[PDB]
Design a protein around this ligand. Structure first.
Ligand SMILES: *C(=N)[C@@H](CC1=CCC=NC1=O)NC(=O)[C@H](CC1CC1)NC(=O)c1cc2cc(F)cc(F)c2[nH]1
Ligand SMILES: *C(=N)[C@@H](CC1=CCC=NC1=O)NC(=O)[C@H](CC1CC1)NC(=O)c1cc2cc(F)cc(F)c2[nH]1
Lengths: 306, 305
């Protein structure tokens, strides 16, 4: 019993973190096979960031302008290429720790683990959701760039996020491992606005089910509702609209708990119209939307990874 | 910027998790050098648990009644011993992944990372605090026993907790790596009451400072209080009394933020007397007491390992 924000074990990712230095800049990179992946703005200086011409800036760089360090091992760079906002340094040694991996571009509403790193050294791990507006609410200081987010499925690391920048609101933005940002953001030293955000309605319901699984039930109504009228209540409160595809995903949780998706929606309605009364659900005074249906199940059924 | 519950990187611990099987029971164990550490109740059957005589029960076991597995490697057991509530199986192969490690009994109020494991396979990592009543609020299912909690200093893993049981309230209890429980608990299939809890006042203050570091300041008052009067307000609300040693530990946070410990206590008074008005601090509608002053500094200054 009990229910926590839980990150994946970070071992397989730790063996892939190096420090990349270009000129005065140093940030983190991801060492897979004989390629190191890092944010392209490692080639910019202090001024370049205002509006960099990266193609021009990278043309002025050669292979030996890059120092890649895996602990104390010095990898020689033997080729360099720029894919979208990601720089790829081809090195001479294939990382012996390379796990089975994929590159994956995740959908809004999905979750992943972040291994926050500084100078190529892991500092901590935590779980995040890709918000509907393509930002994340994490913990990154100067030098955290090139820290990566990932999911582990059995034996395979799925990398989905590489950190690039922080916004004025204090949320975070980055790219997939192919270098394309999530959201409308660009890698220049500018103030950029993410969208209005919305609450991930499907995740909020998966967490209410997690709550029921774990003995919390004070919020369960008798009343029921309709997918159409609930969405009228969703939109008034900034929740992404609940689709029938969402009902079917929520299906095994609705099934395990014996509580119809529609019925749960009505309990959610009252919570939204009526607040929480100074009460708590799974130790929070707010509705949590950073657990997917799959995260609830994996945690509530004890999934492990090889 | 930003402030999250952050676990330590779990790599060094992952290479230490094995699965221990005795008879029908299988739980996790911790493999360091030529010794495997696991909860002693792996010796017990379904019925033994009601009130086991562990000495008698282990006397009936021999080395070969233990199957220890590190993935597929079958370690052979060449000696077994019982230290408090912990069973030590001496094996023939020293774990080659053994990191630099210590065994540490943490004080209440301190925090640590938990690598939740099933069948000797890591499943997830999260951060926890040892409550003042010597329980933890975690996520453990059947078979999570022998999962361990730890801190990483730089190179050195400090093991401080091994999981043994869940309580009726849904909180969790266990031992240090020497086998002595935290709290008044015993390893038998009984319903056991943890004490009244209290809120870790020093941690709540450190989190309010973390809030100030990260731009949240709506709770800062001009009013000030005194250590004596604040405690009369802490007690009415079930907050661990604040000592002068606490003020001094909070000292560099109080210093970084230019806000006197005393003044912050006053803002906390009003938060306690007045609620939060439907507002939030670092993304929560509650006062958070599971961050030590050191956790705030580590996170807000980027410490690595
Ligand atoms: C990379 N290490 C990281 C630095 C960072 C600093 C503080 C908090 N969180 C962080 O993640 N990113 C950067 O320094 C980027 C540089 C690359 C173009 C993307 N820049 C920013 O993150 C940045 C710049 C800037 C200007 C501004 F007016 C307002 C901002 F929010 C802002 N953010
Ligand atoms: C070990 N794997 C783990 C089982 C566990 C099950 C469910 C949720 N969390 C868990 O941690 N621990 C146990 O099975 C122990 C056995 C050892 C004596 C300590 N038992 C319990 O945790 C347990 C027994 C029991 C009886 C009761 F009446 C009320 C309880 F809360 C209770 N808990």
């Amino acid at each position: 019993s009990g229910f926590r924000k839980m990150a994946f074990p970070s071992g397989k990712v730790e063996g892939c973190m190096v420090q990349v230095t270009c000129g005065t800049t140093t940030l983190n990179g991801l060492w897979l096979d004989d390629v190191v992946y890092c944010p392209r703005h490692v080639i910019c200086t202090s001024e370049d960031m205002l509006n960099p011409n990266y193609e021009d800036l990278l043309i002025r760089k050669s292979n030996h302008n890059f120092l890649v360090q895996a602990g104390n091992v010095q990898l020689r760079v033997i080729g360099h290429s720029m894919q979208n906002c990601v720089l790829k340094l081809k090195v001479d040694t294939a990382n012996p720790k390379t796990p089975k991996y994929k590159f994956v571009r995740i959908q809004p509403g999905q979750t992943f683990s972040v291994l926050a790193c500084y100078n190529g050294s892991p500092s901590g791990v935590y779980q995040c959701a890709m918000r509907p507006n393509f930002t994340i609410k994490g913990s990154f200081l100067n030098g955290s760039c090139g820290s990566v987010g990932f999911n582990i499925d059995y034996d395979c690391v799925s990398f989905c996020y590489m950190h690039h920048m922080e916004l004025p609101t204090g949320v975070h933005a980055g790219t997939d491992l192919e270098g394309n940002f999530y959201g409308p953001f660009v890698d220049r030293q500018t103030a950029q606005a993410a969208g209005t955000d919305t609450t991930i309605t499907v995740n909020v319901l998966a967490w209410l089910y997690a709550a029921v699984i774990n003995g919390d039930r004070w919020f369960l109504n008798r009343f029921t509702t309709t997918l159409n009228d609930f969405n009228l209540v969703a939109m008034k409160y900034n929740y992404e609209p609940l689709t029938q595809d969402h009902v079917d995903i929520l299906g095994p949780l609705s099934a395990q708990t014996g509580i119809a998706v529609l019925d749960m929606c009505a309990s959610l309605k009252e919570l939204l119209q009526n607040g929480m009364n100074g009460r708590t659900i799974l130790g929070s005074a707010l509705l949590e939307d950073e657990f997917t249906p799959f995260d609830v199940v994996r945690q509530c059924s004890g999934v492990t990874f090889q």
